[model samples]
Target: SGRENLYFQGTQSKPTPVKPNYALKFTLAGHTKAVSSVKFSPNGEWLASSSADKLIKIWGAYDGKFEKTISGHKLGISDVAWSSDSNLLVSASDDKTLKIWDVSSGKCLKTLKGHSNYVFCCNFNPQSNLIVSGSFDESVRIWDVKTGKCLKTLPAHSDPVSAVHFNRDGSLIVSSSYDGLCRIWDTASGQCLKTLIDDDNPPVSFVKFSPNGKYILAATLDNTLKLWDYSKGKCLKTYTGHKNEKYCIFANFSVTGGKWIVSGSEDNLVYIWNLQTKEIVQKLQGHTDVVISTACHPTENIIASAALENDKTIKLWKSDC
Candidate 1:
């Protein structure tokens, strides 16, 4: 625990013992099912999560007080996202409906329909009111959020579309699919720009653009995470320390004033890597099950990750590791 399963010179112990440190503190534990997603409002005041309980909840991220509980879906809520202003929260469900909500009133404002299967993922674009979603139905669809219109459909994945994410600048889209490839799309043309894959290896489970827009990192069902250089079509590096397939991976330029890549794995650990060296520099251990998601605070150096551990209870850990 001193050096995070990674070595570095002059690295001191993490200072400022933040409350709920080392391990996770169960806050507002009332969901009768496993929590699948957890997101903090851009302002850092509200934290919302979806569950198999067919419910979505928004809470004070720090105080853990219940702010709002959104309901009304026939199946599990798989993913959720917040608008630029954080006033609008959108969610996707196995019910095949994407609903927009006014965070303050917990009111369902708009529901986009037409997908044939569960909406596996969704994102609020960084530049416009456009919303994009991927589904188990094997199609990636883009929508005009203001009018709830489906603009275009990209039906190329042979299986479920696993993840859909927009880069920070909003110019391109990187989508990962069960078809085993992460495809980059030109948002303006709705045309696939490039296909990033592990080359005859494992199928991808998720793909995300790093915060800096310089690289693309992907999580695979093959128990590894690989970083790529999209501009050149090269797999810069592959991290394969996990004991099982990785369910998700997140990489962003550090808001903490450093340059490093951080990720969570099915190995029940949080890994930090040196982006330049392409080496695992640290591994934070805690969760006993697959670490499904990670969210770093927008401003503070603080970080939060959620995982369904052995007993099937989801835990959120605060990390300096």
Candidate 2:
């Protein structure tokens, strides 16, 4: 009886015979098409999501109720992010515009127009008044969170940028691109600080900061997770165990209280590992399709991850221990 063997609660193949523990609709509703991304506010009050429905919705992240729907883009919304202060909500869409919304009253605050193609992902740094976004247009744009202005372009990748994030100090930015490289950038001057190039053919799927901010973690289509120490141009460790080629859809640190590392894979297993021991602490299972996105509770050990297409479902879990 391992946790990884649990069946998904909701699906087209196997419907939920009982209500989910994290009781809620798993959404705010009204998306005419499949939802792409979902994120919880820092304060845990609101949840923001984007969908092929061409709408970006802000919902009570806690109660699973509707708060607001943002529309106006001719193309669909790709990603939605909430500022660390909970004051602004920003989104990138296929419409070629990045719109920032004021969270206080659910109104359109400003729209930053620049990306030439689909804006795939957008993120607000956890400790600052800054924002970063990557697009299918093959570039990453750093912006001033307060003014809605593009500050700098971090370029050099041959393919589109897939993921981007600022370090805990906000002094550096980390990015993973489709070009098979992981880069660390100096935020002030937009210079490439360090690069980890992989020529072995396993393209990097995503990159993120460890909770302590000392390590940069990455996962690949090669079915393994990697840890890179940015201070040095070296990969500290390589984590493996997925049955198929993997995409580390999401990997988050275990805050200060625990030293666990949790990862959700396209293999459909939400796996947790020990950062110190380098052991697979547990393999959390539920969804039957590829796992798409993962979000962890700020204060607790609970996890919320969703799968796309054939399994458009989100499941919530907490450490059974």
Candidate 3:
């Protein structure tokens, strides 16, 4: 009888609580066109989806209940991010603007305008007082969230900027572009600290900073993912065996000790890689179309993904544990 005390409760006690033995938990239905982006709130309580159908839908992260839909973008939505407190939401779109929404009221708080072309990505700073946005105009703009004023505009890339992310401490930002380079910038002075480029120089589709601020992960059009040493400007490893030539595929690392790398693929499946060995450890199938967007929960072993066009639903995945 005392043997029961040898194990911890639920999933916490298991050494490998989240494993490659994951299955589809549920499908989040709605959205008319391809879902381009999906994000989990900072607190892991809400999940947000941005679609080519021109709408942003919110759902309960754990329960799979549709909460609210925030609509304002005139064209396809490109990206979505949540504030540190998870009470406010920010979205970028092909409409050439960024909109800040008050989540509780389901109302738009402020509309930021400055980019001459489509704004492809946006994120809130650590304090949630400032916002950083990257555009197809080859620029990255800093904004004051409260006043909706453009503080500074950095001519970030020579070509269209595809993805942007703020590092964990909010001291720097990483921006990737069609120019086949990933540049790290100083948030305070808007200076380009280091430009990371591989010999192949493949056009990057998405870039993200790992939660610990030690490495940067980027998805390339050449059908590979590269992990970089940010401070040294060196390419540490290149992970392969996934498709990403036609659509913008997003990928990310699992939580602190989850030990997995997850990404959506154009092959209509989700792939998980061994973070250390760079081997394909798991492949999940469900979406009939391109699985171009995905999100990994911050504190849990949950993964979410959305398919394009006909299969416009967001699917959530969890392991057997």
The candidates, ranked best first by TM-score, are 3, 1, 2
lDDT of 3: 0.88
Candidate 1 lDDT over residue span 259-295, tens digit each: 4566667676766666666566666676666656666
* Model 1: CA > 4 A from native: 1-28, 246-254, 278-288, 309-316, 319-321
Candidate 3 residues lying further than 4 Å off, grouped into runs, are 1-4, 7-19
Q: How does model 1 fare in lDDT?
A: 0.73
- Clash pairs (backbone) in predicted model 2: 4-285
- TM-score per model over all chains: 0.85, 0.82, 0.94
TM-score, prediction 1: 0.85
Using lDDT, give the best candidate's number: 3
Q: Write the per-residue lDDT of candidate 3 for residues 1-321, one digit (tens) a residue.
A: 787869855655546534577778889988989898999998999999999898999998888899989998899998999999999999998999999999898899999999999998999988888899999899999999999999989998988888888998889989999888898999889999988886678888889898889999988898899888889877777788889885668899976345888899989999988887788888888999999888988777788999989799999988742
